[PDB]
Ligand binder design. Structure first.
Ligand code: DTP
Lengths: 100, 36, 50
């Protein structure tokens, strides 16, 4: 989840800076996709949480969306979690309506 | 004679029963879409 | 304690949560939501802390 503490987060200002200047170049592509690749327990979720709980990013993006995917998952729960993060009601519903 | 055919029946019956008996405990051990 | 009156003037939103031997995380989360005043919405865990 995007809820963390930002007091124990030992300095990530360089990585945060670089990823923020990557996100300011969003319009220069059609759909900017980025990857945080590393081994287990290295900082990937926390560097993402440190990124999009900043304020410049929150002014930039209207609808920021967190999605948890795991080992065990299914497609429609990912879809309706995106719907919940957007603001749609959690409606018992099927998959072809969700993308529409 | 019926002797040769009876022993053929024996061998194939015993192989079927043996395969059942040694497969069955593995099933005893564990228990267990497209759109547009 | 928290059915007294001085405490009820002090705290805006007092919350009882039952946790037991058998429990799970998301039911604790949505019970906190119910005690707050949010609707009991069928929902997943990452939205609940937000
Ligand atoms: N810079 C940091 N300062 C303080 N704590 C940190 C820092 N980076 C990571 N942590 C802590 C947060 C968590 O308690 C723990 C695991 O990190 P986390 O980001 O959740 O893992 P990860 O995203 O690298 O991999 P995964 O999600 O696969 O476990 O490390």
């Amino acid at each position: 989840s995007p809820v963390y503490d930002h007091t124990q987060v030992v300095g990530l200002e360089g990585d945060k800076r670089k990823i923020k200047e990557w996100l300011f170049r969003s319009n220069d592509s059609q759909l900017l996709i980025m990857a945080f690749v590393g081994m287990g327990g290295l900082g990937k979720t926390t560097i993402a949480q440190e990124v999009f709980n900043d304020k410049e990013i929150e002014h930039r993006f209207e609808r920021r969306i967190w999605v948890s995917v795991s080992q065990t998952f299914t497609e429609e729960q990912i879809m309706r979690s995106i719907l919940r993060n957007l603001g749609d009601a959690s409606v018992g519903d099927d998959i072809g309506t969700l993308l529409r | 004679l019926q002797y040769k055919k009876s022993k053929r029946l024996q061998e194939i019956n015993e192989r079927i029963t043996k395969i059942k008996s040694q497969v069955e405990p593995y099933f005893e051990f564990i228990t267990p879409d497209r759109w547009s």
